[PDB]
Amino acid sequence: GPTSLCCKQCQETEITTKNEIFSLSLCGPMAAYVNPHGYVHETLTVYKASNLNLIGRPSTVHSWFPGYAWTIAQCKICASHIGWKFTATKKDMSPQKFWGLTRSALLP
């Protein structure tokens, strides 16, 4: 469909849709300055994704989104590294989980 964001490598596999896109705030209380950490402008954040295999267990090592652990996520079909599943380290956070997907790994 027109909303469909698919793996660039295998083409047919849908990973997420435009409907699931949201904007995660990268600042803390009062929206202070933060030192940029990783490469967020290159990464699309969605609530929900599909047809990915998670590799390994969540890690908090040098997370691009502090407060979240990351788990590598690759396409089930072709095993291309599409991005990561992010999981909250604290129960009071929202969302408790999301996906950070590398924009260039997706079509469109």
Give the annotated binding-site residues for (S)-thalidomide: 62, 64, 70
Please say which residue, 52 or 69, places its beta carbon nearer to Zn ion. 52
Please say which residue, 4 or 80, places its beta carbon nearer to Zn ion. 80
Residues belonging to the binding site are: 7, 10, 62, 64, 70, 75, 78
Among 21, 40, 77, 88, binds Zn ion (CB under 5 A): 77
DSSP states along 38-90 = S-GGGEEEES---SEEEEEEEE-TT-SSTTEEEEEEEETTT--EEEEEEEESS
From 37-45, 55-63, 74-82, 84-92, give the range in contact with Zn ion by CB under 5 A. 74-82
Among 7, 44, 49, 106, binds Zn ion (CB under 5 A): 7
| 78 is a contact residue toward Zn ion (CB under 5 A) | yes
Residues that bind Zn ion (CB under 5 A): 7, 9-10, 13, 75, 77-78, 80
